Amino acid sequence: EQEKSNLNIEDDGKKAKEKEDAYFEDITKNMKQLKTQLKSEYLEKEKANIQQ
Amino acid sequence: VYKQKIKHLLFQNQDQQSELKKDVEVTLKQLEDQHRIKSRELKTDVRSLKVTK
Amino acid sequence: EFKEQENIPRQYIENSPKEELVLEHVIQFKRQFQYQLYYEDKRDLFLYPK
Amino acid sequence: MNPSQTQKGKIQIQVSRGSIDLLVRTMYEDINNIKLKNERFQKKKRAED
Amino acid sequence: EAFIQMLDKNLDEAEDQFQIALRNHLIHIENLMQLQEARMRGLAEEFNRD
Amino acid sequence: NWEYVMLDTLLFNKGNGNDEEGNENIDDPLNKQAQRDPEQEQLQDIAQLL
Amino acid sequence: MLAKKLALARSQGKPDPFKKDEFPLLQHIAVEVVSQNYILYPDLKGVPENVRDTIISKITTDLDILTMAPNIDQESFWQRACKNRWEKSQKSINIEEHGRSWKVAYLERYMEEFLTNIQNADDPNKKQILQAELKAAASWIHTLNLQNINQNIDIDFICKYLPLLTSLTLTYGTKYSGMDYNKQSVGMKLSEAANLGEAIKNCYSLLSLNISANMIDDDLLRFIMAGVNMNISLIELNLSHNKIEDQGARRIAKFLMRNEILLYLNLGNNLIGYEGSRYLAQALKVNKNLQSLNLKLNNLGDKAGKKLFQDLMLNKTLLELDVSGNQFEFETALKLSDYVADSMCGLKVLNIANNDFNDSCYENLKTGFTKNYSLAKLDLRGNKFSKTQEEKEQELKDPFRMFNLSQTEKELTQIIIRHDLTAQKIQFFSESDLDKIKQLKELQGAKQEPEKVIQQDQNKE
């Protein structure tokens, strides 16, 4: 009983870890993609401004 | 006697299950706090660069 | 005298957490620069003005 | 000014309140009815013994 | 007669510990509910701060 | 000859900005499952940029 | 050792093996010895705090509590000790719950586990050492907490040394219950109740007492209260999951009449009858400082609840209500609706779960519950009210889906939430509102695309 319950609890913890990792990495990808619209897209837009 | 002893070291099971639950909860809290800190730092950088843009 | 204004801007008295982390990264890079420049004379990387 | 453009705060806060209430309903749909049966058995056996 | 009373005193003790086990189970479910409330409240707080 | 104190994301994250000329073959993504180096993501994640 | 290495190097006169800048200062050796010989240096008087923190950081985590407590207050050091002790233990300290001090939480935990491991505390040397430890801790003792103890603990002797304890928690049990069956091993008995009450009466600054999980009955509750009668600092009393009988209920009513400062009350899960219900209702009706009434896991009876609601009509301070499971029905429902119809009610918590109400009470409850403005939350699950067929389908398919709220319970909850949030200046999107918004949004999304189709095919000519 103890072995099964402890293993189940720790698998619960590990699956929670995986879920939270995926969630945070998705949020980080959104933030960094948006930021890339602020440094790289910044220089692209500067080129657009000068050409226009 | 033996039935109550099963209502006992089952006490060991209770204590160790509670230990694992609290360990999982606290590690979850630590990881989530780290996530929130990094999220706010990244959002600060994003906001500062959006202001410049 | 500019710091003598009665309402010194808070931005002029404390640096944000990211500013201090940037300061720590600057100090780290300075330490690495000194460690791997055993042969070249020191040159002031004036990265932390006042 | 566009009335909808200038009022992001209230509309989003309404959305947030709705999400909170909808989640409360979902999480509340499946808890706390066990205690009712346990206590009713307790009091039935109280009036019984 | 003393056995039947014991059959309901042995049973009385048994019933007492089944009531004890039910009280413990209700307490454990109450703690689960309290900490699930803590998790949901934390989620709501973080979401609304964001 | 000239050394950069900080490694920014301008250089490493401009690969996916090259689909400007796309009006051509719709090549099936069945053969574009190249296994991304675990080293790249792992070192991007553990050596956090400043 | 440095002298030894120097002698080895000189043994030949060869080139120096140790650099001049490789020689640590006298400070290094002194700090190394102090970290290794802190017993001779518990004081470090006159040594600047800088070297103090240096040594603390460079010391291990097996120091003595009696000496660490007075001379050591560096938080990271206490966290080092916490890592060394309870990183792989059952639990780790929760900082916000320990006065924002690692040292206090570590000290309290070591007190718990010492009083647990302690065998025959009456033993002279052990008792003297315990007294010395309490005296040393007199500076940073805030709360005391023990669950499932196995000793006839002398509360007063400990309490006399702790006028600063902020909360007290005593629960009877068998932390180490061996093979042998001992029904007397679980359940707090007469002597401990008397001693704990006496220690209660021997206190000046205690803020809360929790004697929960003690199966406390009238005889034992009598000693508890007699201890709690004369002391002039009690604010919180926890008495849920005990054996409180009618005498306990009458004494509770009398204390409520006499009480002037109590703020937290818990008296659920007991064996109280209607007499106790009447006494509690009368005590709290005149009450004006008590916050919450705890009568859940009880057997008041419909007359008991009706009498309680009638008494609490004059009450204006009972705001948290938790009386779930006292068998209140139509009579209690109508009486509580009449009570809530008033404009003088400020209740904040309403726990009336574990009842046996019926659908016929709708016109009353709604009616009465149509007259509630300042309330916040209430519990109504598990009723046998009008149940839809699909609900029964869900219980049959999923026993864990028996928890589904009945529609009328959700209706009362929605009405209360609507009034409360309109109080908090909040507009409402219920199930119907959500359906309206979703259908409107889908309508707009559908109606926006054909415009795109027409205007795009406008460029095909």
For residue F28, the number of C-alpha atoms closer than 13 Å in the C-beta half-sphere is 2
Distance from CA of D8 to the nearest CA of G (A): 15
Nearest to G356 by CA among D39, F1, A9, E34: D39
Q: Which two tokens stand for residue C35?
A: 């460690």
- How many residues are recorded in chain C? 50
> Which residue of G382, G400, G429 is in closest CB contact with D36?
G382
G320-322 β-sheet, strand order: G292-294, G320-322, G349-351, G377-379
Distance CA G293, CA G33 (A): 60
Q: Which two tokens stand for residue C26?
A: 């600057």
Q: How far is CA D41 from CA D47, E9, E22, G354, G405, in A?
A: 10, 19, 10, 10, 21
Say if residues G190 and G220 touch (Cβ distance below 8 Å).
Answer: yes
DSSP G44: -
Q: Which two tokens stand for residue C31?
A: 């330490």
| Alpha helices (runs of H) in G341-383, residue ranges in sequence order | 362-369
The residue behind tokens 């703690």 is: E31
Partner-chain contact G241 E13, CB within 8 Å:
no
Nearest to G289 by CA among G268, G318, G253: G318
Contacts of E45 in chain D (CB under 8 A): none
Secondary structure of chain E in the HEC alphabet? CHHHHHHCCHHHHHHHHHHHHHHHHHHHHHHHHHHHHHHHHHHHHHHHHC
Distance CA F28, CA G286 (A): 81
Scanning E1-50 for CB atoms below 8 A from G yields 13, 20, 23, 27
Partner-chain contact E15 D49, CB within 8 Å:
yes
- Contact of F47 with chain C, judged by CB distance below 8 Å, is answered with no
List of residues 6+ apart from F1 with CB closer than 8 A: none
Partner-chain contact C16 B45, CB within 8 Å:
no
Q: Which residues pair with G321 in a beta bridge?
A: G293, G350
* Measured CA angle at G36 (ends G34, G39), to 5 deg: 70
Task: Return the SS3 of G237.
Answer: strand
Contacts of E47 in chain D (CB under 8 A): 16, 19
Computed on alpha carbons and rounded to an integer, the radius of gyration of chain C in Å comes to 16
Distance from CA of B41 to the nearest CA of C (A): 7
Q: Given in angstroms, what resolution was this structure solved at?
A: 7.4
**Sign of the CA dihedral with G430 first, then G431, G435, and G438 last:** positive
Distance CA C29, CA A17 (A): 34
Contacts of D37 in chain E (CB under 8 A): none
Q: Which residues pair with G83 in a beta bridge?
A: none
Number of helices and strands (H, E) in chain C? 1, 0
Structure-solving method: cryo-EM
Task: Return the SS3 of F25.
Answer: coil
| Closest residue in G to E13 (Cα–Cα) | G183
Number of helices and strands (H, E) in chain F? 2, 0
Say if residues G340 and G310 touch (Cβ distance below 8 Å).
Answer: no
Task: Return the SS3 of G351.
Answer: strand
Distance CA G180, CA G174 (A): 12
Distance from CA of F2 to the nearest CA of A (A): 22
Q: Position G56: which residue type?
A: I
Region label for G241, one of left (φ > 0), alpha (ψ between -120 and 50) or beta (otherwise): left
**Sign of the CA dihedral with G41 first, then G42, G47, and G52 last:** positive
Distance from CA of B3 to the nearest CA of C (A): 59
